[PDB]
Structure 1
């Protein structure tokens, strides 16, 4: 058994959230919760919110118990990118790429 939870179209760089994700991959639920809590990063908030929802989905829809699930796997995906202009010296016009994320978090039953 496993429960997914995706957060598409999140305004933030992939490489940036990848760091946060790589921290909790394969971690106990409560253990991960505390990591995101006091972890000094912006990507923390977006991973914590979705991961939190992954638990709700795991419970209210998959008969999984809160006290026995973990992160079977998780990963962020690169969504589209919001290209913007940028006034540069001597009139050069460089495009800036405000990328987006696709954080995925899948929980799972532990053992027996």
Structure 2
């Protein structure tokens, strides 16, 4: 389905997909200007990560299609998958130890020329 000419992918980003998905829901299908404004405004780590990936996707589309400006572009699809995990130890009382997982996420954004 993907026009892989027009897309950006960010692998192993430092946030959990459970925390990045809602921000993706708020910009899926919006216009590029509106999405960029939302991501700049909202002070969430996932918001900043999506901002980088979305800006890169728009840049790729513009570079390969010179007659496409920032205001014909809308964020067509947005996918947020889960990535590698790292386990570190958190020690507790009575010699008990717990493993403390750190999750990463993959982010895939495709833009498309507006309706």
**Which structure shows the higher strand fraction?**
2
Tell me the TM-score normalized by structure 2. Answer: 0.89
Indicate which of 94, 109, 114 corresponds to 1:110.
Answer: 114
**In structure 2, C-alpha distance between the alignment counterparts of 1:61 and 1:93, rounded to whole Å:** 53
**In structure 2, C-alpha distance between the alignment counterparts of 1:13 and 1:84, rounded to whole Å:** 16
| Residue 97 of structure 1, CA deviation | 0.7
Hey, which bits of structure 1, 4+ residues long, moved more than 6 A? none
1:72/1:106 contact within 8 Å kept: yes
- Give secondary structure in 1 for the equivalent of 2:103: strand
Tell me the TM-score normalized by structure 1. Answer: 0.92
Q: Unmatched 5+ residue regions in structure 2?
A: none
**What residue number does 1:21 align with?**
24
**What residue number does 1:49 align with?**
52
1:6/1:105 contact within 8 Å kept: yes
Q: Unmatched 5+ residue regions in structure 1?
A: none
1:32 has 2:23 as partner: no
| Residue 10 of structure 1, CA deviation | 0.6
**In structure 1, C-alpha distance between the alignment counterparts of 2:12 and 2:18, rounded to whole Å:** 15
How many residue pairs were aligned?
111
**In structure 2, C-alpha distance between the alignment counterparts of 1:26 and 1:7, rounded to whole Å:** 19
1:91 has 2:64 as partner: no
What does the per-residue CA deviation read over 1:71-110, in whole Å, with 9 as the maximum and x for residues that have no partner? 1110110011011111111111111111001011110112
